[PDB]
């Protein structure tokens, strides 16, 4: 029975900072990759960031290129997202997804409002 | 972000551009040129086109004639049965999908394509296991026709269903490959929930390598008018039947392993689709040899045609 | 009303219930049971399935061999060419449409199905005109010291068949879905004066059907007082020409008769199963002809085996 | 160049009567059939009535069964529709169509408001 916690996030002022979390439970964590995906108000899902199973090579969207940074802990089953120098459009509900896809396992999410 | 995994699928093409779609929901013309999909459908037509008559006539001639009941003929009928299940069960779906550009039937449409194509190759392989044992027993003669061969045909259908069925059950799954026109065992995505990683080890060793050991074991024993030809030409054809099998299925089997190891690496849709569709000649190539080499059958084939 | 006419179509099923839809826009499963549409697609598969190899091999064997250049072989190649144009041009569309239940391709999809199926029957008919003339000239011998022409006789068939099948595509007449709305054919139903299909049907029946039959039975009428090499090559070939017509009359009369019945009784109470049976039955025109060329003419059958069993 | 006139029709009170007209031009009239079709406000077209080319056998919808009656003049190229004992729902825009179909040549018709 798979479970993905969606810790970290809340209300932050423009040009601020925020470090999200994604605790994994009930599967071989380091044998899969993990991504971050957000849900803007009105607009469709955006694939934010992604990283390999080992964690060597991270990839970001052009939207949040360089500003955001993704990193994972294989030992403690966690995926972080240090979001820095935020903007108004980054206002969204953030989810962490498995594999390489935008399909989201059910998660608490996190209301990141900028 | 080299490939694009989904619940059902894995598209070997990055979804940074945002173009990637499910190969059950929409066509995959962004993977390769639209004419390359018609090239598949054209190629796939000829497999169905020359597949049915050769397999049907070979089935007809074998059953019609009360003669021709040597184990060789039983297995080459067994293939002809399976090869028809390929042409109707599998090849129809891929020919239809090749046109549309995606599995418009749905996830079950993929299962058909993979299942019967998996049977065809495994039933053909486990048949070459039986033939290798049969040619061994006659030549080397450890023991001082229509019985053992019939049980040897039961062996192939038992062992092939140990390969192709479990994907349908739950252990492993069938997933679109390359251009997303064919299907096959999930090498690309671990999908631990399904446990396809464990199945691939199972499939390669137990379904494929074990046979190859048994075939080359039996071939290793044979290193040192009727009986002088029926022993030679038949055992010679058994070798040519394997040689053709090794040409056919190694391309796919090698690429399948490459992808199994390098999951998430940078590879395109043309990588797998070439050796995947090449391996679908398994329907036709086997009973071409049975006509081409074995002249005994060729004579009795003409009896059925030219009455 | 009894039927249901539209801009493109005519559905032989009343639209009082409000169920009737265009056979280009939506499926026609209200006409007959859904499995009956799969019965067409299944049947239509076998026409394509046994069509390609027999026509292709017959084309291959005739061209491969420098021998076998008698007028009989030229025409039976000419058929094999047309029969492939049937299988690829026409039969693909109907097999695809039979599955979906409607011409999902569109109005042009209908044109394909009707066009190449019209050619196949006309090229076969005008070929039997040439054969009837050829068997007449050899037996009765109207021109002395006589016995190239076949190649010009093949040009005759393609000229005359295109005088039938092409005009619908141009404007004079049109191709319209028939019966279950899976096949197509010449508009016997709607007058469509704008198209002038009423005038074409008279044209098609007389000029593209009846006139041939007169010429065939005219030439057959010459061989009434009549009926190793010359005693068999005269007999068996001329015998096969008759069997080739006999099969044609079995094949195309069902459709040709029903087409006339509908041409007379436009708007009468008839269902979708009425026309679709003789329509799809006539699509055996692809396969039946070069079965006889193998079955009867053993001379070819020997040389066919040469190509197969090399 | 085909042309269908749509004479007759206007404002009439409930339970009234009205006789429509449809003058044909530029085709062999008596060689095909003609129908009547109406356009209610909001809802789709309704096939009202139809008749054979000769004019022998008329057919009506269940909606206007018996109340309406259709008749044609082959000599003068005309089709009539004696609509009697009208109702509120008969409020529509009436067209006369060719063949047996609902496709309407020309347009405008006649504003029959009850
Ligand atoms: C066989 O028989 C069946 C049933 O008897 C028949 O099906 C009907 O086909 C007609 C078309 O031939 C359909 O009518 C159309 O409906 C359109 C909208 O209707 C939908 O929404 C309503 C909801 O109210 C549903 O009940 C309905 O089922 C539909 O889903 C309508 O837009 C069409 O008409 C407008 O557009 C045409 C084209 O431009 C125009 O010519 C019309 O005049 C009309 O525009 C309006 O005109 C008025 C008058 O000038 C104007 O004031 C108004 O502003 C315009 N409209 C607006 C608001 O913009 C059309 O009527 C009908 O829905 C079908 N019924 C079914 C099955 O649902 C088949 O056609 C028959 N088969 C054949 C063809 O043989
Ligand atoms: C490859 O990458 C592309 C990148 O775009 C992916 O495409 C996106 O897929 C996501 C999948 O969820 C889509 O997100 C959903 O959009 C719905 C609306 O889409 C339509 O309307 C918007 C209007 O704003 C248009 O912009 C858009 O084009 C569509 O016409 C929303 O309604 C969905 O929200 C609902 O469902 C989600 C489920 O997760 C809930 O969380 C929400 O609360 C809500 O109930 C959702 O946001 C997104 O629209 C797609 N983008 C595009 C291009 O339209 C591909 O999916 C990906 N490839 C594959 C198939 O894996
Ligand atoms: C739908 O199809 C039916 C069946 O074909 C059509 O019925 C035909 O209707 C005409 C007109 O009523 C009949 O003509 C009359 O026949 C009688 C007896 O034969 C004759 O005495 C009259 O002088 C006249 O000619 C016709 O017979 C009848 N067909 C039969 C026998 O069923 C019907 O007309 C069609 N519907 C439409 C919209 O036209
Ligand atoms: C896409 O595939 C490329 C090529 O296989 C990957 O690039 C490799 O990245 C690893 C580290 O993750 C390096 O050790 C290799 O040397 C790279 N290969 C070379 C030489 O190009 C890339 O990481 C893949 N991207 C993702 C995230 O799937
Ligand atoms: C075109 C459709 C295909 C290739 C579907 C499935 C094929 C397989 C699962 C093939 C695997 C193997 C076979 C059949 C033959 C021996 C090697 C093998 C186990 C990799
Ligand atoms: C399945 C599709 C079909 C049958 C399409 C068209 C067929 C015709 C237009 C056939 C008409 C006739 C032929 C070919 C043979 C002689 C009689 C004919 C003119 C009625």
Numbering used by the authors:
A (entry chain D), D (entry chain C): 1 to 114
B (entry chain B): 1 to 144, 149 to 228, 241 to 323
C (entry chain A): 1 to 147, 151 to 230, 241 to 323
Study authors write:
Rhodopsin (Rho), composed of seven transmembrane domains, a characteristic of all G protein-coupled receptors (GPCRs), and its covalently bound chromophore 11-cis-retinylidene, is a major component of the intracellular disk membranes of rod photoreceptor cells. Upon photoisomerization of its chromophore from 11- cis- to all-trans-retinylidene, the photoactivated rhodopsin (Rho*) undergoes a complex sequence of structural changes, leading to the signaling state of the receptor, metarhodopsin II (Meta II). Crystal structures of Nb2 in complex with native rhodopsin reveal a mechanism of allosteric modulation involving extracellular loop 2 and native glycans. Nb2 binding suppresses Schiff base deprotonation and hydrolysis and prevents intracellular outward movement of helices five and six – a universal activation event for GPCRs.
Among the 4 Nbs with high affinity for bRho, we were able to determine the crystal structure of ground-state bRho in complex with Nb2 at a resolution of 3.7 Å. The asymmetric unit of these crystals contained a parallel bRho dimer, like previously observed bRho dimers, with Nb2 bound to both protomers at their extracellular surfaces. Inspection of the bRho/Nb2 interface revealed close contacts of CDR1 and CDR3 of Nb2 with the C-terminal region of EL2 of bRho. We observed that Phe27, Thr28, Lys31, and Tyr32 in CDR1 of Nb2 interact with Pro194, His195, Glu196, and Glu197 of EL2 in bRho via electrostatic and van der Waals interactions. Glu197 of EL2 and Glu201 located at the top of TM5 also formed electrostatic interactions with Arg98 of CDR3 and Lys31 of CDR1 of Nb2. The placement of these six critical residues of Nb2 near the extracellular surface of bRho revealed a binding “hot spot” on EL2 consisting of Pro194, His195, Glu196, and Glu197. The bRho/Nb2 crystal structure revealed that several critical interactions involving residues in the N-terminus and EL2 stabilize the complex. Collectively, the crystal structure of the bRho/Nb2 complex together with our validating mutagenesis and biochemical studies confirm the discontinuous conformational epitope of bRho, which consists primarily of EL2 and N-terminal glycans. The structure of the ground-state bRho/Nb2 complex was virtually identical to that of bRho alone. We show out that CDR2, CDR3, and, surprisingly, the FR2 loop of Nb2 maintain extensive interactions with Rho’s native glycans in the three crystal structures.
